[PDB]
RNA sequence: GGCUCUGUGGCGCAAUGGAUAGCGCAUUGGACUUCUAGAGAGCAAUUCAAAGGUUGUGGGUUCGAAUCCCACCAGAGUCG
């Protein structure tokens, strides 16, 4: 077998660095301060600006999430059942995320990962705190939840949304001179082409499944103050998640997902090597202008 | 030499120094997909995990600076030692943080002294939750990960052997040999963005489109890409490899006639 | 028309490309007021081309009329680049040409294709 | 069924029986008579100037527009140097000239039967545009793509759509203040490829518009 | 009926004993880019700045309370 590669140990913070992290200003340094150039002419000013921007970026990416162990609601990772069980009582996020069953406060995998990223909880596995790398590795697979799905989940939660996992001659012209009276009359006579909608005849395709399936239900940020888990109501939009390389959903997929969604707008959550491109197909009836 | 843990064809970098080396030395910047520590609830500036493209990983492995390793799996031969070390580390952090908090409080009280005295005169005359822990963005322990073979298609590297990846890798290698910076251009309607320098300070000019030679080009797609480049002040730049070990480009622009 | 039969006197390609070339010639001459446009052909690819002058005293500019309903593999693009370079008198300038796509309503859009890189 | 909104069609800051005759030359349609051109571009805004940008103030009708005029209205009769063509022969000739003419004409008929005046979206990279009340008055609001599928949703993709192409078209139509609409055309799967020769198959055809609009995750955060 | 949790700018949130109570989205202004049948659009053609407050109300501890403690007001989850 090939030799074994030893990945080096990550960064470990100290007490001084932790305290400095907790005294940080949440002001984001501006990306590439000043307008953007268009031709590299070698001017020392350009080199100085590049040095400044790069040093800012490296000082930014070298920061570690630091949180107090009074608001870090502990949690445990259960791979067999396939969720996360909270040891301590939950917090504000419990008004919109997680579910209670069997008498315990249990979190889904993607929700637990998002909370770990935001510093809301302190995830564990076999009595060891999971870093974000190990959490990405374990909680994100082809069985529990993909990587693109978690990407979109975390994005929409960072914006402040509520994303809840989905739970189901012989041939003649069409017109003759004797029927040209009003624009609407003609525009209806020559309208033999009958329009439809995405769900029309959408019941007979759920059997033809495979590929793209709805994932999440999205409630806007404003609906976070008064959110009822048991009776949340009609979500803002149901979310399907794909990749930029994967093929565009065919009309079969559109009809199937629209029927499986109902009166909720459909949204697709493309990922292109990190970028997120929430395009949304939506049925549309062109008004008879 | 660096390391890029690969899993399900996803190259991610969890070290700041690795990204610093990639962007400066090897002219590869990639994209960030994590959440920023100093503010997690914004999407303007994201976190550490660098989502290197499959080509950006294959090429970096093909030049002798990146060793694609497969994501390790839990090993039951180290859990007791890990638990002991973690308990010792947490106790050490508890003690040090308590001491530092006490000293900081004492210093601030000394600074506000005589003002506390003025307040008290004007009045009379008339730690567990404090502990701080790091939610590390990378493994705090070293792991032994088996290297990755990227010339043979596998489950952790499903790219090798496919045409859509080989063509893009060839075009990426040829455009990177010329010192350009490269980035994905899904939003701009192309497979790459070509920057004359670091994309932080400089714009881009070319919106690449990695077309296979024999693959038919729909003229509507070409026209849309050209107009998009015009509206963004960029020139559509078709790319394609050739059997003679050479790549030919064709800068498509809009003639203001 | 003199130039219409000039394009149609070379017996190259199909009728659609001949008419596309006639439209592109008409445009580039009677709309942009180019100094002079001369018809050309290309039996090597059943193709038609036009060579004209943007400004008096300046160099020539190749044109490659195209209908929207025609595929264009990048190999065909390289072939036409080399053909245009041969038509340009074989100068040292990078190969280039014009791709005046044409729909059935005579709409014309010009996207010049140049070998190598060309900044905006 | 979350029917998409009908964002108001913006206006331009500035502004401003007879049997027609067209001649099919070089696999293209042409109109020569002056008054015929004036009525064709004024009373409906059909075609484009022979050499000008929009109007012939110094007319070549596209395939879809000419076929619509002959079939849906019966005013235009295309010719081939001696021959008044018939609607079936027009279908066949225009399919031979362009293999994917049936789909585009069906979409054109559907959109123009709703009062919108469509034009070619070549400049923006699409198949049809939609000017409300005419090009001069309103800025076109819809850039239309067209496809075809059967009742089982399986057919020959007229124009393959990778997410790159859709992203590019959406960005272009956003920058020019337009909506990118897909116009999937659905046909019975039990229809043989012999009825397509006649144009009456449309009556059995079913249209499905899908407004593909970008969703900026930050702007739709609340209302 | 009991128990747990929540309340900070229009919205999502940081700060959880001491500076100016701050960050993003949003809004309003600058600079630039394109606009060809596009005042707009602007997403590595993008890039900057300002303003925005009942910190749920009341009381207490304390020299300062959004930080801690009580009374309650509204809201969510669980049990019975
Ligand atoms: Mg709030």
Author numbering:
A (entry chain D): 6 to 173, 403 to 523
B (entry chain C): 1 to 126, 179 to 309
C (entry chain A): 43 to 162
D (entry chain B): 1 to 16, 37 to 78, 297 to 461
Reproduce, without paraphrasing, sentences from the article in which this PDB structure was first reported.
In this work, we report the structure of an active human tRNA splicing endonuclease complex bound to an intron-containing pre-tRNA, revealing the recognition and cleavage mechanism of pre-tRNA by human TSEN endonuclease complex. To obtain more homogeneous samples and capture the in-action structure of the wild-type complex, we reduced the incubation time, omitted the subsequent gel filtration step, and kept the sample at 4 °C or on ice, which preserved the integrity of most pre-tRNA molecules during the process of freezing the grid. The conformation of the endonuclease-RNA complex observed here is poised for the cleavage reaction. Interestingly, the complex structure presented in this study differed from both the catalytic-dead state and the post-catalytic state.
The removal of these introns is carried out by a conserved splicing machinery known as tRNA splicing endonuclease (EndA or TSEN). In archaea, four distinct types of EndAs that share similar architectural arrangements but employ different domains and subunit compositions are observed, including α4, α′2, (αβ)2, and ε2-type complexes, while the eukaryotic TSEN complex is a heterotetrametric complex consisting of four subunits: two structural units, TSEN15 and TSEN54, and two catalytic units, TSEN34 and TSEN2. The C-terminal domains (CTD) of TSEN34 and TSEN2 contain the catalytic region and are arranged close to each other, which is the structural basis of the conserved recognition mechanism known as the ‘cross-subunit cation-π-sandwich’ pattern.
